[PDB]
């Protein structure tokens, strides 16, 4: 048969690291969505004190983790109480 190289390398990325080379000019290396960056290697939704019980959702602008105030609070770091 025909042997087919195969343009990528170890993997750099975790949690879901999938290495999908695109022949147009690279490859990717595809992770799952909801941890980090390209590698995916860590979780941006670890307990963040902007939590304080609230929510942690995620977000492109800051580094893949939104820290969401609980309802009735809200703060800049979720330490305030609503009224």
């Known amino acids: 048969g025909v042997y087919y190289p195969n343009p990528c390398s170890p993997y750099p990325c975790r949690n879901g690291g999938t290495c999908k080379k695109r ?4 490859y990717k290396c595809y992770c799952r969505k909801g941890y980090t960056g390209k590698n995916c290697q860590y979780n941006a939704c670890f307990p963040n004190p902007c939590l304080n019980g609230g929510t942690c959702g995620y977000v492109y602008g800051y580094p893949y983790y939104k820290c969401s105030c609980p309802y009735g609070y809200y703060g800049k770091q979720c330490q305030l109480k609503k009224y």
């Open 23 to 26: 022949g147009l000019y690279s």
